[PDB]
Structure formats: C-alpha cells, structure tokens
Amino acid sequence: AVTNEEIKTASKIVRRVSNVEAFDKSGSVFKGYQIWTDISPTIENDPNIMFVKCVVQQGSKKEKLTVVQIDPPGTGTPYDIDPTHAWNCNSQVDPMSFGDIGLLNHTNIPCVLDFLKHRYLKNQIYTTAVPLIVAINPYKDLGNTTNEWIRRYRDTADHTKLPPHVFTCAREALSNLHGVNKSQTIIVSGESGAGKTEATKQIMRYFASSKSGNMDLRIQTAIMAANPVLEAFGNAKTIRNNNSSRFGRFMQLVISHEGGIRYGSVVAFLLEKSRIITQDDNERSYHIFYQFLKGANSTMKSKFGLKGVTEYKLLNPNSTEVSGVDDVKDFEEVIESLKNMELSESDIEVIFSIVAGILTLGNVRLIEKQESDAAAIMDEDMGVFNKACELMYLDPELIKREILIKVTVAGGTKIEGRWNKNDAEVLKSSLCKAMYEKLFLWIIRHLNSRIEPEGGFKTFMGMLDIFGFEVFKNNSLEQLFINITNEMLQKNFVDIVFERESKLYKDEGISTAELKYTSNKEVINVLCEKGKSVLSYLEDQCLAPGGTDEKFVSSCATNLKENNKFTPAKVASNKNFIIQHTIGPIQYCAESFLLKNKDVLRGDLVEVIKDSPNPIVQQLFEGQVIEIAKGSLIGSQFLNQLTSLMNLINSTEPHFIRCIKPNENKKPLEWCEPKILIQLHALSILEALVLRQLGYSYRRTFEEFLYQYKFVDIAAAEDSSVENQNKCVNILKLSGLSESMYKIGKSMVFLKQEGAKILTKIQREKLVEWENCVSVIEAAILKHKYKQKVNKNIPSLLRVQAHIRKKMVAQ
Amino acid sequence: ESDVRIYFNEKSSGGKISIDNASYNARKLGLAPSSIDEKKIKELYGDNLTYEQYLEYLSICVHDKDNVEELIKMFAHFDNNCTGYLTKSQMKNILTTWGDALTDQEAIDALNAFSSEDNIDYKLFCEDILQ
Amino acid sequence: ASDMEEKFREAFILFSSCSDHIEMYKFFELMNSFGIILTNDEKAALPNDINMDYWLNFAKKHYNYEQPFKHINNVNEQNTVQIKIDNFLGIMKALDTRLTESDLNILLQITNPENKTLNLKTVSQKLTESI
C-alpha cells in the first residue's frame, strides 16, 4: 500500500527540466499536442499513478495551459495547469523498438516511467541506461531464462541484435575477460524482493552452460549446489520477500570461454544473527529450520528428539507456513545439495545435530533463584539442556557454568558471582546465534575448500548480490553498514564512468577539461575515515568503559562539523542523527548501537566450543583470539571485510544490474509509479542518464556521420575531392552549429546532444519536399503492420464468435 | 448420444442433413462450430451429409483446446494498458469487423446480456460464453 | 463506382484500438495511410474529438479514388521518379520514420522485386494494390 511518506519522498525526486513546445511561431497550439502532467483527479484517487497524459487545447496561453486528459480515460473536461506542471511527451515512439532509455527524445521522469512500463507490460523487463542494466521483477515465470534462451544469447552471432537481458551482461563480461585478460565483476543491487538473487542464479546458469562439456563438472556441480544450501541457511520469509536473502554474497568464478565453471570461491557477510532468536509477526526464521523439522524422517526425529515447527521458542509459532513453499521438497534438495558439496553422510548428520541442538537449547527455560538474584535452569528442563549440549557436541557442565556463573573485576580483583535471569538468557541466546552463524560460515569454508584453485585466482569473474540503499522509518546499525557499502559501490560506478569517458576523449584528442565528476568522497570519509568518522567513534565508544549510545552520538556531532555530511537530528537529537548519503538524507537511530556492535560471542564460552571432541564443532570458531578488543567488534570487522572486498572489485571491470520491484503485492503486471520512481532514484538510473548526456555525448565515425547527415549539406557530402574527415568539417561549418557544439577527433565527430538534435532538424528541413511522400509511405506500412497483428489473433476470435452463436441457440 | 440422433432426425431429409442444420444441432449439443469447421466438411462431403458424416462433423466441432486463455487473445491484443477491461464499443467493433463477424445487433445483445456496465472484464465474458 | 466505407472503418479501429474515437495524432496517421494530406490550416479546422462517423465522411471527401497515392507519384505530372535505394532509406531515417528495419524490409518486400534505384511509381502502385 502506498504510504503518504512514499508520496512525499516520490514528489521530491520529481523535477521539471526542459520546456514544452506546445505553440508554433504564430503562437497557436500545435493541433493535438500531448504532454504529461501530475495534476489530475486520476492521481488524487489512485496512488499507483503519478502522471497522466493530456492534450493541450486550442487557445491555451504560454503561461497557463488548458489541457484535457486522454490517458487514462477521463471526462473531456478542460482544466488549467501552470507550465511547470507539464512535461514533454514521447508521443509516437514504440518503446519496444530499442533497448536504452537515452535514445528517447525526452528522458524526463514521466517519459522514463512510461517507457519502462510499456516494455514491462509486454514482458520486456530489461532496459539499459548505459552502463546500467535495469531489471524489473515480473513476479511470474516469463520463460525468458530457459536453456533455450541461454543458448540463444550465447550462440547468436551478434547479440546486440537481441533485446537487453541479464545474459547480455553475462556474455559481454565473459567476452571481455577472455578478450583482454581482465577480471570482471557483476554487481546486482536493489531493494528487498526486487529480484537480485534470481538474476544472480540466472547468470550463474548461463556461465555453467558449456557449448561442449565441462571436465570440471564436479566443481561446477558443487558451486551450483550451494545455491539451495545458502538460501536455506541464510534466507528467510519476510513481509517483503518470501525468500529474502539475509546476508550479502560475493563470489569469484573461473569460467571457460565456451562456458563451464572450473573454480570458484564464496563469501557471505552481514548475516542477520538476531533472526534466529525472534521474528516479527508474519515472518519466519531461516528456511532450514522449517525444512528440517518438517522434512526429517522418523529415525532422524527420534534420534534428535525433534518436535514440531510450532513447538520451538525460537520459531514464531504462527508463521510456519509460506504459500507456494514446500519445505519438505526443499529439504530433500538441500540434503542432495550438501552431498554434491562433498559432505559425507556423517558430516551432514553433524550439521543437523547442531541445528537440532540450537533449537533445543532455545527451549530451555531459566528462572530467578533468590536466596543476590541468580539464574538457574528450570529443573524440569535440565534434561532438555543436556540433550541440547549433546546435540552440539558440547560439554554440558562447562556450558552451564558459562551461562550461570559470572566473573566481574572490582577494584583490581576477580570476583565470582552469578548472572541474573535476564543476563543469563542473553548468554544462552548469544550461544544459539553464534553457533548458527559459525555453522553457516563453516559450510561455506568447506565448500571453498573443494572449489577454490590451489594458487589463488589469476583472472576471475566476480559477482556481488547485495542490498541496495535502504531508507526505513527506523534505520539501525544494520542499515548503516548496508548504506556505507553502497557509498563504496556508488564510487565504483562514478569512477568507471569518468575513467571510460576520459579515456575516449584522450584517445580521440578531445579536451577533458569539460568533464564532470560528482564525488562522494566527503560522505565516505564522514562514515569511515579513521579517527574522524562515525565508524571510528562507534568503535571508540564500544572500547570505552561507560560508553553509551548518546555519548557516541554526542562525540560524533561535536567532531564532524567540518563537513555537511553529518547532521544532528532536530527531533530527539540525543540518540538520532542524519547522514547526507548520495541519494539524500537518511536518519539513523543510535539506540542499541553499542549493544549490536558488541554482539559477538567471546571469552571462555568460545574456548569450551573449541574443546568439543567433534572435529566440525572444533572448527566453528577455529583460530578466534581469546578475550573487549576491536577485533571482536562487528563494525571494525565489517570495515576490514568491506575494504578488502572493494580492493578486489576495484581491480575489475564492473557491470551493474539494478533491480526494481514494481509493486509491494508480489503481483505481475501491476505498476506502482511512486514506488518505482523512488527506486529509479535510489539506483542512480535517472543520474546515469544525466551523466551520459553531458558534454560531447554523441560520437560517430566520419563515415557514420556522413551516412547519417548526408543531406545537411548534400553538396559537401558528395564531393569526391575532399576526404571523409574533411567533409565532416565542411558540413558542420556550413550547418550553423556553434563551434562549442562539436569537436572533430582522430576518427570521430563529437557532438553535444543539443548539437545533434539541431543537426537532425537541419537535415529534415533540407528534405521538406519528401515530408508528404514519407508520411504516406510510413502510415500505409503501419496500417499493414497493424493488420498483420490482428490476423494472428483471428483464429482465437473465431472461437469467441462461435461460442456466442452457440449461446444464441441455447435461448 | 441419443440427443445426437434425435436432433439429426428433426432436421433430416432423405437421410442427409444440411450443413446449416448440422451446425445448428452441434450448438444444441453445446458445441461451437465456425466457418473453418463448415469449410472442412464441405471439402469432404459437399453440402449434405449422411448420418456417418454428420457424426464426423460433430467430431471436428469439439475444440477441446478452447479455454479462457485461447479465446481472449484478440481482446487482450487491444488492451494496451493491460487493465483486463475493454469498453462495449471496443468489443463490438472487434466482433463485427473480423472473423465470422457478428452483426451489430448480435454483438450488442451478447455484451448487454453479460453486463450492464460499459467496461467489460473480457476474461469473464469469455468464461461466461464458454459454458 | 467503388465503395471504401468498409476499408475506412477497419482502418480507423486499427489506429484507434477499436474505440469509436481517435486521438488527433493517430488520426493524422490514419488519413495518411490512405494518401490524404492536410494543410496546417485544414488541420486546425478539424474537431478536437474525432469519431468514426466524422472520419468516414472526411475520407469520402478527401480520398483520391483515382490516384490514392498521388503524393508518392502523380501520373498527371511527367516525372519520367527513380532514386537510389540507400538514399531512399536515408531520407526515411532523416525524417524520423517509425518504420523499424523489419518494416523497411516490409516496405521493400511490397515495393522491391530485385535489388535495383527504386521507382516511386512502383511504390505507389504496390501500396495501391495492398489497400
């Protein structure tokens, strides 16, 4: 449902740039002239709609247009809009006829939305805004990613003659990699439920399709087998996505030039630990718990003492069932996949023993024992506790002491005491979370030990599947980390666009002094610079006795004045603050920041786990340092991960897939314009258009220019005496363009967009005596085209007409 | 099956039945023949059919592949914004222009029966007439 | 004496998506598909909301029954008419033709036999045959 906060932010993104040319030199309205506007009862009444199409009426005035809405259908009523509420319209263009948004005459917001929409309603869900690929979730199987479409995009001689697709990106990336021996990274971003993980798997399947076999099938099978396993352990049903990834995924892959994955390496970061302890309503925990409890056979349930999905504290008893999701069939696939990852049957039984032990431990109840206030395991549940630790291959007595016995330092003396109930529950809970997270990461380390190359990667295909910018009502620490990640990726995007444009200008002799670059250096620094940043002061406060959320906030406001990018909050300034992210201000709540940042199992508990006699459980925490140090802080560990990850990505040629969720109802063919526009903005699709249009954005070879612009000055263009490069100079000099509107390169004519549009009108003016001939030829062919489309559906029509005449008899 | 024979006998003359009467029967039996079906049996047997050929004709007219999805194709083709609706005028022009065109009055009567509103869920219109 | 009403009617609903009214831009294409050309004055004189009956009457009055595609090639004028095929395609592209390359192949399918130099009288004749 469209929130009034969503209408508010969507209307801030809305801008009006170019002027509407509704009048001729006479001052009369062009007969039938069409515009977009955001003023319409249709728009007040339907929150899915932000603009409507109207005809300007004979008699309007330049300062106040009189218009009548035509699409969606209206009343015929004239009404008046200020020109700043009218937008040019691409009235006669077929949106299916080309793949990039920037080929439209007008790329204002209502025009962009309408172009994507009509493509999408025809199931063409992929569109470019170079270098971006836009992918709109169709919420149905379109049939466009089968093996037959892989083979089509792979084996077609000229793939640029196919429509945009994620396979176009997979092919062009693999081709460059093998073409110039350069690593590549495909970066897939977007909000929850937009389609990033599906896109990722589609691309993976393309890369796994070899023209003539893969001798390393064993390793490819393990890599592909990991998708259901990573989804089971790391994905959960939320309100926005029945299959929400609750981690970011980075992969490296080695792929033969004809297809087939030969090596790989997987990385998961930012796992939502809290999900395993509690879940909002209508939401589940990680799929694996439900797969396991419903899918385990009677011998495994009896062995582990398993109860039903509705009988575990850690599992929301009311959301256990997800429509369209068969957890039993999913479990069978997970068990098959673990085998394909070269885990033995014994290995797999340990894995699910640990899973059953975490669940069982969650069901152990504690009580307040007062004789100071101490905690104890309810005597009724002591056996449940012991079975939980047995299932985890953990020492039951030592695990007990760590949850119940406290050691405090007062003065400079160690004083044994007792955790109270609340604290002991936190400790029991943190053991559950830590065991689950380390088991996930252990499964990945096992996978990597089977698929990685011995000596590291020479050249590799990267793939990142991560949350895009997130702006929620309550933004917390998890959102901060996500939005820092996306500032790093934004920079990767603006840098590669600049690098590539600068290189082309230089290779062609054109001056780069006119090139623009929108740095986000200041905001990255305010977030990450050592000593002078939010992450620096979150760390300091964590490492300080008597640190507080509010002191963290306070220390930030006082020390980060020298840049606008930090802004204290007007409302509740004590525990809230605002960052000026590239996509706009985002408000975070520091409440619990220090808590969440310290939520890492440390200390003697980790040493009890490492002492397990079971080899897998010993490895869960392998090599962890004994202990509060910053090496145990989520924010400090996260920034190390991020920096390492971006150094790797920045060493590659990036590709950007930007996924869009078109409505919040998981439905096909439903288009919510305010939600989509908000995503156009947060994905930098509108910005990518701007960036590309700037400067001398039109380039063509001398003979391309001449094939395109012969009739600007047909004389100069058909002079055999003068050379091609010199013909272009002649034509351009005689055209009337200002010197500022074009430059001649080594091999190309550079034009500003405005310059190319003028030259197009100039050529048409020189051809005015063909206007009527071409108009009639065109219209007559279009009528033929429209009739052929009808003829396809006539057999169907006969069936409708036939049944009508049947019902007539039956009456 | 006896309905088959009974209806034939009401329309038979000299053991043979005219194609127009065979199509009328076939509709009484709940089949929906079209000019394509009538052209098929004309190519084989001319304009008057023996009982055996009348049964063969009823075979041609079964059209099991008929379903809401196959019938709506032409209406969906003109539904550019994908609303699922067309006005009555749109569906009237379609039914009265192409194919085994209905007369204007036949098209109106069929639309006005199914609904009294100008905009018609054409998926439901086709489901209604498929019964 | 040759009645075009049926052709005029079909064409209208092809360009209007089967509605009894048509947008001004689509009306220009419709009339252009029958060789009809209006001055900017005659254009401004038109109704703002053109319906079927309006178009059927305008078409009778404006269609050139003797020379439907006069504005491609006029037989009254002694044009002796023959221009280069790639220039033709250039002019079409200069004037922002909505014809896709497939359509331009459609155009060349209808009007070209052999890869010759294209004759506009051939164009006009071929389109006249396809009305």
Ligand SMILES: Nc1ncnc2c1ncn2[C@@H]1O[C@H](COP(=O)(O)OP(=O)(O)O)[C@@H](O)[C@H]1O
């Ligand atoms: N290309 C697609 N084609 C068909 N269905 C899709 C497609 N992409 C996503 N979906 C549907 O949307 C759901 C969520 O997509 P997902 O990739 O998990 O989103 P994200 O990973 O961005 O959070 C999928 O489970 C699927 O139902």
Ligand SMILES: [Mg+2]
């Ligand atoms: Mg995902």
